[PDB]
C-alpha cells in the first residue's frame, strides 16, 4: 500500500518532543503520533489531526542523481535512528502553475536540493509522500530519521534549504519532532 | 474537486458507441457512461465498472510546449464536440522505475508526443487524469472529444501514438467510444 497516515493524539509508536509552527497555520500540540500504512477515514478517538499521503514515482531526479542517492542513502528503521522529524509542506499556486523545466530548474539548478541533501547522508534517512492530489491542506509530508549524534547537522540542513530559491514558494511549514518508543 | 469518476452502466450523459479492447483485459460493454466530478464509493446499481482519477500538475511539458498548446487547444464542451473517447492506459513497472530524464527523453525526444498531438489541434479537445497513485488498475484516464468530421484524423492519431517508443511501455489500453446524449 502506497498510502501512509499520521494521526496526532494520545497513542502511537512515536512521542512528540516538540512542534514548531515555522510558516502559516500550525498543528495542535499532541503527545504522540500513530503511523499507519493505509487510509484512515475513521477519525480516531482523542486525536487532534490526521495527515496522509502516498508514495509515488520520481518527479525531478535524473538517473545520475538517483545513482548517487542509492550509493549512500540509509534504510528506514535502523536501530540507532531513534529521532524523527515529520515536516508537512505546502507550495504556492504560482509554483504549481509553472511548467516542468521551470520547476526542475528552481529545484536543482538554482537550489541544489539534491546536492545539498546528499551532504547529510548517510546520517539522515528520509521518506517522501505526496498529498496535493488527495486534496489535503498540505502538498507534501516529509519524513526524516536519524541518531542523536546527527541532530545538529539535521538542523543545519533545515536552515540551508529554507535559504534556497525553492523555499520562496513554500507557503506553509510545520516541523513535528519525534522520539521512537 | 480535482477527482473525476466514470461509471459504465445503464445511465449517464454519454452513450457507448463501441468499446475496443486494444491491449490487456477489456471492459464490459455497457449502454452509457455516467461522469461525475467527485469520488464515488457506492458502486451504482446496474453498473458494470467504475474508473476514477484526478487532475494534477504538469509532469513533462516545458514552458514553450505549454505556450504552443495554449495558443491552439480547444475547451471541453464545445457544442460541436458530440463524439468522445475515453482511453484508460497502464504503463509497465519498468517505465515507473525509470528516472525523470529517461522518461522525458522517451516521451518527447524519442516519441514526439506533444509535437504529434499538436497536429490534431484544434479539432481535438482532451483531458488527462492520473490514477496510479490511487491504487487503480489503470495508471491514466485520457479523454478526447471532437466533432464527427474529425473521427478519421483521431483514428490516425491513435495508430501513430501506438507506433511510438513510448507505447512499448504500455501494457493495458481500452478505447471507449461515446456520443453525447
Ligand atoms: C536529507 C537529504 C535530502 C535529500 C537527499 C533529499 C532529496 C530529495 C530528492 C532527490 C527529491 C526529488 C524527488 C523526486 O524527483 O520526485 C526531493 C524532493 C523533496 N524534498 Fe528533499 N531531500 C532531502 C532533505 C529534505 C528536507 C529536509 C526537506 C524539507 C524540510 C525536503 C523537502 C523536499 C520536498 C518538499 C520535496 C518534493 C518537492 C516537489 O516534488 O515539489 N528534503 N528530496
Ligand atoms: C490529441 C492531442 C494530444 C496532445 C496535444 C497531447 C499532449 C499531451 C501532453 C502535453 C502530455 C504531458 C502532460 C504533462 O506534462 O503532465 C500528455 C500526456 C499524456 N498523453 Fe497525450 N496528448 C494527446 C493525445 C493523446 C492520446 C491520443 C493518448 C492516448 C491514447 C495520450 C496519452 C497521454 C498519456 C498517457 C499521458 C501521460 C504520460 C505519462 O505521465 O507517462 N495523449 N499528452
Ligand atoms: Cl523518497
Ligand atoms: Cl490535460
PDB file of N, CA and C and ligand atoms in Angstrom, chain A residues 56-62 65-66 69 73 87 89 91 95-96 103-104 107-108 113-121 124-126 128-130 140-142 144 154 157-158 161-162 166-167 170 173 175, chain B residues 100 103, ligand 1:
ATOM      1  N   UNK A  56       5.083   7.834  -4.395  1.00  0.00           N
ATOM      2  CA  UNK A  56       4.874   7.952  -5.827  1.00  0.00           C
ATOM      3  C   UNK A  56       6.203   7.863  -6.575  1.00  0.00           C
ATOM      4  N   UNK A  57       6.103   7.921  -7.900  1.00  0.00           N
ATOM      5  CA  UNK A  57       7.250   7.924  -8.785  1.00  0.00           C
ATOM      6  C   UNK A  57       8.057   9.223  -8.663  1.00  0.00           C
ATOM      7  N   UNK A  58       9.286   9.143  -9.161  1.00  0.00           N
ATOM      8  CA  UNK A  58      10.225  10.251  -9.159  1.00  0.00           C
ATOM      9  C   UNK A  58       9.701  11.363 -10.069  1.00  0.00           C
ATOM     10  N   UNK A  59       9.757  12.612  -9.596  1.00  0.00           N
ATOM     11  CA  UNK A  59       9.297  13.763 -10.374  1.00  0.00           C
ATOM     12  C   UNK A  59      10.441  14.642 -10.933  1.00  0.00           C
ATOM     13  N   UNK A  60      11.640  14.675 -10.308  1.00  0.00           N
ATOM     14  CA  UNK A  60      12.668  15.643 -10.709  1.00  0.00           C
ATOM     15  C   UNK A  60      14.060  15.001 -10.902  1.00  0.00           C
ATOM     16  N   UNK A  61      14.435  14.064 -10.027  1.00  0.00           N
ATOM     17  CA  UNK A  61      15.749  13.442 -10.074  1.00  0.00           C
ATOM     18  C   UNK A  61      16.067  12.782 -11.418  1.00  0.00           C
ATOM     19  N   UNK A  62      17.285  13.003 -11.911  1.00  0.00           N
ATOM     20  CA  UNK A  62      17.762  12.308 -13.094  1.00  0.00           C
ATOM     21  C   UNK A  62      18.557  11.068 -12.672  1.00  0.00           C
ATOM     22  N   UNK A  65      21.694  11.352 -10.533  1.00  0.00           N
ATOM     23  CA  UNK A  65      21.320  11.746  -9.189  1.00  0.00           C
ATOM     24  C   UNK A  65      20.791  10.522  -8.450  1.00  0.00           C
ATOM     25  N   UNK A  66      19.931   9.727  -9.102  1.00  0.00           N
ATOM     26  CA  UNK A  66      19.359   8.545  -8.479  1.00  0.00           C
ATOM     27  C   UNK A  66      20.467   7.594  -8.063  1.00  0.00           C
ATOM     28  N   UNK A  69      22.231   8.901  -4.948  1.00  0.00           N
ATOM     29  CA  UNK A  69      21.375   8.668  -3.796  1.00  0.00           C
ATOM     30  C   UNK A  69      21.441   7.208  -3.364  1.00  0.00           C
ATOM     31  N   UNK A  73      22.213   6.279   0.567  1.00  0.00           N
ATOM     32  CA  UNK A  73      21.056   6.545   1.408  1.00  0.00           C
ATOM     33  C   UNK A  73      20.778   5.351   2.317  1.00  0.00           C
ATOM     34  N   UNK A  87       7.723  16.706   8.489  1.00  0.00           N
ATOM     35  CA  UNK A  87       7.648  18.095   8.062  1.00  0.00           C
ATOM     36  C   UNK A  87       6.694  18.209   6.889  1.00  0.00           C
ATOM     37  N   UNK A  89       4.644  20.333   4.129  1.00  0.00           N
ATOM     38  CA  UNK A  89       4.993  21.480   3.321  1.00  0.00           C
ATOM     39  C   UNK A  89       3.884  21.719   2.309  1.00  0.00           C
ATOM     40  N   UNK A  91       3.380  24.294  -1.117  1.00  0.00           N
ATOM     41  CA  UNK A  91       3.959  25.257  -2.042  1.00  0.00           C
ATOM     42  C   UNK A  91       2.851  26.115  -2.656  1.00  0.00           C
ATOM     43  N   UNK A  95       3.936  28.249  -7.879  1.00  0.00           N
ATOM     44  CA  UNK A  95       4.784  27.088  -8.100  1.00  0.00           C
ATOM     45  C   UNK A  95       4.062  26.070  -8.970  1.00  0.00           C
ATOM     46  N   UNK A  96       2.826  25.711  -8.602  1.00  0.00           N
ATOM     47  CA  UNK A  96       2.148  24.617  -9.276  1.00  0.00           C
ATOM     48  C   UNK A  96       1.786  24.934 -10.725  1.00  0.00           C
ATOM     49  N   UNK A 103      10.218  24.295 -12.888  1.00  0.00           N
ATOM     50  CA  UNK A 103      10.304  23.754 -11.540  1.00  0.00           C
ATOM     51  C   UNK A 103      11.608  22.964 -11.390  1.00  0.00           C
ATOM     52  N   UNK A 104      11.972  22.182 -12.401  1.00  0.00           N
ATOM     53  CA  UNK A 104      13.221  21.450 -12.322  1.00  0.00           C
ATOM     54  C   UNK A 104      14.387  22.397 -12.048  1.00  0.00           C
ATOM     55  N   UNK A 107      14.459  23.829  -8.563  1.00  0.00           N
ATOM     56  CA  UNK A 107      14.686  22.759  -7.601  1.00  0.00           C
ATOM     57  C   UNK A 107      16.173  22.365  -7.549  1.00  0.00           C
ATOM     58  N   UNK A 108      16.837  22.215  -8.713  1.00  0.00           N
ATOM     59  CA  UNK A 108      18.213  21.729  -8.720  1.00  0.00           C
ATOM     60  C   UNK A 108      19.194  22.804  -9.193  1.00  0.00           C
ATOM     61  N   UNK A 113      18.913  21.202  -4.402  1.00  0.00           N
ATOM     62  CA  UNK A 113      18.214  20.422  -3.384  1.00  0.00           C
ATOM     63  C   UNK A 113      18.903  19.075  -3.158  1.00  0.00           C
ATOM     64  N   UNK A 114      19.215  18.357  -4.227  1.00  0.00           N
ATOM     65  CA  UNK A 114      19.762  17.014  -4.109  1.00  0.00           C
ATOM     66  C   UNK A 114      21.231  17.060  -3.687  1.00  0.00           C
ATOM     67  N   UNK A 115      22.024  17.909  -4.332  1.00  0.00           N
ATOM     68  CA  UNK A 115      23.426  18.044  -3.984  1.00  0.00           C
ATOM     69  C   UNK A 115      23.568  18.450  -2.518  1.00  0.00           C
ATOM     70  N   UNK A 116      22.712  19.370  -2.054  1.00  0.00           N
ATOM     71  CA  UNK A 116      22.784  19.825  -0.667  1.00  0.00           C
ATOM     72  C   UNK A 116      22.390  18.694   0.283  1.00  0.00           C
ATOM     73  N   UNK A 117      21.284  18.007  -0.025  1.00  0.00           N
ATOM     74  CA  UNK A 117      20.759  16.933   0.806  1.00  0.00           C
ATOM     75  C   UNK A 117      21.715  15.757   0.933  1.00  0.00           C
ATOM     76  N   UNK A 118      22.414  15.443  -0.172  1.00  0.00           N
ATOM     77  CA  UNK A 118      23.429  14.391  -0.212  1.00  0.00           C
ATOM     78  C   UNK A 118      24.553  14.599   0.809  1.00  0.00           C
ATOM     79  N   UNK A 119      24.842  15.839   1.189  1.00  0.00           N
ATOM     80  CA  UNK A 119      25.881  16.073   2.175  1.00  0.00           C
ATOM     81  C   UNK A 119      25.458  15.556   3.554  1.00  0.00           C
ATOM     82  N   UNK A 120      24.175  15.223   3.768  1.00  0.00           N
ATOM     83  CA  UNK A 120      23.678  14.836   5.090  1.00  0.00           C
ATOM     84  C   UNK A 120      23.379  13.334   5.141  1.00  0.00           C
ATOM     85  N   UNK A 121      23.793  12.609   4.096  1.00  0.00           N
ATOM     86  CA  UNK A 121      23.649  11.159   4.034  1.00  0.00           C
ATOM     87  C   UNK A 121      25.009  10.532   4.298  1.00  0.00           C
ATOM     88  N   UNK A 124      21.177  10.812   7.805  1.00  0.00           N
ATOM     89  CA  UNK A 124      19.729  11.018   7.711  1.00  0.00           C
ATOM     90  C   UNK A 124      19.046  10.066   6.719  1.00  0.00           C
ATOM     91  N   UNK A 125      18.031   9.350   7.217  1.00  0.00           N
ATOM     92  CA  UNK A 125      17.103   8.612   6.376  1.00  0.00           C
ATOM     93  C   UNK A 125      15.878   9.479   6.086  1.00  0.00           C
ATOM     94  N   UNK A 126      15.176   9.222   4.973  1.00  0.00           N
ATOM     95  CA  UNK A 126      14.067  10.074   4.569  1.00  0.00           C
ATOM     96  C   UNK A 126      12.973   9.272   3.857  1.00  0.00           C
ATOM     97  N   UNK A 128       9.429  10.377   1.336  1.00  0.00           N
ATOM     98  CA  UNK A 128       8.658  11.455   0.757  1.00  0.00           C
ATOM     99  C   UNK A 128       7.286  10.961   0.321  1.00  0.00           C
ATOM    100  N   UNK A 129       6.277  11.734   0.731  1.00  0.00           N
ATOM    101  CA  UNK A 129       4.903  11.444   0.389  1.00  0.00           C
ATOM    102  C   UNK A 129       4.304  12.689  -0.239  1.00  0.00           C
ATOM    103  N   UNK A 130       3.362  12.435  -1.151  1.00  0.00           N
ATOM    104  CA  UNK A 130       2.633  13.443  -1.893  1.00  0.00           C
ATOM    105  C   UNK A 130       1.183  13.467  -1.405  1.00  0.00           C
ATOM    106  N   UNK A 140       2.812  18.103   0.735  1.00  0.00           N
ATOM    107  CA  UNK A 140       3.766  17.021   0.962  1.00  0.00           C
ATOM    108  C   UNK A 140       3.930  16.719   2.444  1.00  0.00           C
ATOM    109  N   UNK A 141       4.203  15.454   2.746  1.00  0.00           N
ATOM    110  CA  UNK A 141       4.706  15.050   4.044  1.00  0.00           C
ATOM    111  C   UNK A 141       6.125  14.517   3.850  1.00  0.00           C
ATOM    112  N   UNK A 142       7.062  15.088   4.590  1.00  0.00           N
ATOM    113  CA  UNK A 142       8.426  14.620   4.505  1.00  0.00           C
ATOM    114  C   UNK A 142       8.762  14.016   5.848  1.00  0.00           C
ATOM    115  N   UNK A 144      12.022  12.229   8.151  1.00  0.00           N
ATOM    116  CA  UNK A 144      13.458  12.123   8.359  1.00  0.00           C
ATOM    117  C   UNK A 144      13.713  11.446   9.692  1.00  0.00           C
ATOM    118  N   UNK A 154      21.206  17.868  11.087  1.00  0.00           N
ATOM    119  CA  UNK A 154      19.867  17.979  10.536  1.00  0.00           C
ATOM    120  C   UNK A 154      19.369  19.422  10.643  1.00  0.00           C
ATOM    121  N   UNK A 157      20.950  21.437   8.008  1.00  0.00           N
ATOM    122  CA  UNK A 157      20.289  21.183   6.729  1.00  0.00           C
ATOM    123  C   UNK A 157      18.976  21.979   6.591  1.00  0.00           C
ATOM    124  N   UNK A 158      18.122  22.020   7.625  1.00  0.00           N
ATOM    125  CA  UNK A 158      16.858  22.742   7.529  1.00  0.00           C
ATOM    126  C   UNK A 158      17.086  24.198   7.166  1.00  0.00           C
ATOM    127  N   UNK A 161      18.111  24.698   3.445  1.00  0.00           N
ATOM    128  CA  UNK A 161      17.041  24.509   2.482  1.00  0.00           C
ATOM    129  C   UNK A 161      16.170  25.762   2.461  1.00  0.00           C
ATOM    130  N   UNK A 162      15.899  26.308   3.658  1.00  0.00           N
ATOM    131  CA  UNK A 162      14.991  27.437   3.813  1.00  0.00           C
ATOM    132  C   UNK A 162      15.578  28.746   3.309  1.00  0.00           C
ATOM    133  N   UNK A 166      14.050  27.667  -3.987  1.00  0.00           N
ATOM    134  CA  UNK A 166      12.910  26.779  -3.841  1.00  0.00           C
ATOM    135  C   UNK A 166      11.990  27.256  -2.718  1.00  0.00           C
ATOM    136  N   UNK A 167      12.562  27.628  -1.561  1.00  0.00           N
ATOM    137  CA  UNK A 167      11.755  27.844  -0.367  1.00  0.00           C
ATOM    138  C   UNK A 167      10.974  29.147  -0.408  1.00  0.00           C
ATOM    139  N   UNK A 170       7.368  28.168  -0.755  1.00  0.00           N
ATOM    140  CA  UNK A 170       6.770  27.437   0.352  1.00  0.00           C
ATOM    141  C   UNK A 170       5.882  28.364   1.170  1.00  0.00           C
ATOM    142  N   UNK A 173       4.498  25.460   6.553  1.00  0.00           N
ATOM    143  CA  UNK A 173       5.504  24.517   7.013  1.00  0.00           C
ATOM    144  C   UNK A 173       5.370  24.335   8.519  1.00  0.00           C
ATOM    145  N   UNK A 175       7.291  21.640  11.607  1.00  0.00           N
ATOM    146  CA  UNK A 175       8.188  20.553  11.971  1.00  0.00           C
ATOM    147  C   UNK A 175       7.592  19.820  13.171  1.00  0.00           C
TER     148      UNK A 175
ATOM    149  N   UNK B 100      13.586  10.643 -14.191  1.00  0.00           N
ATOM    150  CA  UNK B 100      12.727  11.635 -14.810  1.00  0.00           C
ATOM    151  C   UNK B 100      13.271  12.106 -16.161  1.00  0.00           C
ATOM    152  N   UNK B 103      12.427   9.194 -18.701  1.00  0.00           N
ATOM    153  CA  UNK B 103      11.037   9.204 -19.111  1.00  0.00           C
ATOM    154  C   UNK B 103      10.783  10.391 -20.045  1.00  0.00           C
TER     155      UNK B 103
HETATM  156  C1  LIG C   1      18.255  14.793   3.736  1.00  0.00           C
HETATM  157  C2  LIG C   1      18.674  14.803   2.471  1.00  0.00           C
HETATM  158  C3  LIG C   1      17.708  15.120   1.432  1.00  0.00           C
HETATM  159  C4  LIG C   1      17.766  14.524   0.226  1.00  0.00           C
HETATM  160  C5  LIG C   1      18.874  13.593  -0.198  1.00  0.00           C
HETATM  161  C6  LIG C   1      16.629  14.935  -0.464  1.00  0.00           C
HETATM  162  C7  LIG C   1      16.390  14.508  -1.741  1.00  0.00           C
HETATM  163  C8  LIG C   1      15.257  14.801  -2.436  1.00  0.00           C
HETATM  164  C9  LIG C   1      15.048  14.430  -3.781  1.00  0.00           C
HETATM  165  C10 LIG C   1      16.030  13.679  -4.657  1.00  0.00           C
HETATM  166  C11 LIG C   1      13.832  14.892  -4.158  1.00  0.00           C
HETATM  167  C12 LIG C   1      13.219  14.741  -5.525  1.00  0.00           C
HETATM  168  C13 LIG C   1      12.226  13.589  -5.579  1.00  0.00           C
HETATM  169  C14 LIG C   1      11.660  13.385  -6.979  1.00  0.00           C
HETATM  170  O1  LIG C   1      12.296  13.588  -8.055  1.00  0.00           O
HETATM  171  O2  LIG C   1      10.483  13.003  -7.043  1.00  0.00           O
HETATM  172  C15 LIG C   1      13.304  15.549  -3.019  1.00  0.00           C
HETATM  173  C16 LIG C   1      12.061  16.137  -3.012  1.00  0.00           C
HETATM  174  C17 LIG C   1      11.657  16.893  -1.931  1.00  0.00           C
HETATM  175  N1  LIG C   1      12.355  17.184  -0.793  1.00  0.00           N
HETATM  176 FE1  LIG C   1      14.089  16.555  -0.283  1.00  0.00          FE
HETATM  177  N2  LIG C   1      15.885  15.716   0.303  1.00  0.00           N
HETATM  178  C18 LIG C   1      16.461  15.896   1.473  1.00  0.00           C
HETATM  179  C19 LIG C   1      16.029  16.672   2.527  1.00  0.00           C
HETATM  180  C20 LIG C   1      14.872  17.431   2.522  1.00  0.00           C
HETATM  181  C21 LIG C   1      14.366  18.224   3.579  1.00  0.00           C
HETATM  182  C22 LIG C   1      14.974  18.460   4.931  1.00  0.00           C
HETATM  183  C23 LIG C   1      13.166  18.726   3.164  1.00  0.00           C
HETATM  184  C24 LIG C   1      12.235  19.616   3.869  1.00  0.00           C
HETATM  185  C25 LIG C   1      12.449  20.167   5.052  1.00  0.00           C
HETATM  186  C26 LIG C   1      12.960  18.269   1.850  1.00  0.00           C
HETATM  187  C27 LIG C   1      11.834  18.565   1.129  1.00  0.00           C
HETATM  188  C28 LIG C   1      11.565  18.008  -0.109  1.00  0.00           C
HETATM  189  C29 LIG C   1      10.294  18.227  -0.816  1.00  0.00           C
HETATM  190  C30 LIG C   1       9.115  19.078  -0.365  1.00  0.00           C
HETATM  191  C31 LIG C   1      10.365  17.550  -1.962  1.00  0.00           C
HETATM  192  C32 LIG C   1       9.312  17.488  -3.008  1.00  0.00           C
HETATM  193  C33 LIG C   1       9.481  18.627  -3.999  1.00  0.00           C
HETATM  194  C34 LIG C   1       8.427  18.598  -5.090  1.00  0.00           C
HETATM  195  O3  LIG C   1       8.016  17.494  -5.582  1.00  0.00           O
HETATM  196  O4  LIG C   1       7.986  19.703  -5.478  1.00  0.00           O
HETATM  197  N3  LIG C   1      14.024  17.497   1.502  1.00  0.00           N
HETATM  198  N4  LIG C   1      14.192  15.474  -1.950  1.00  0.00           N
END
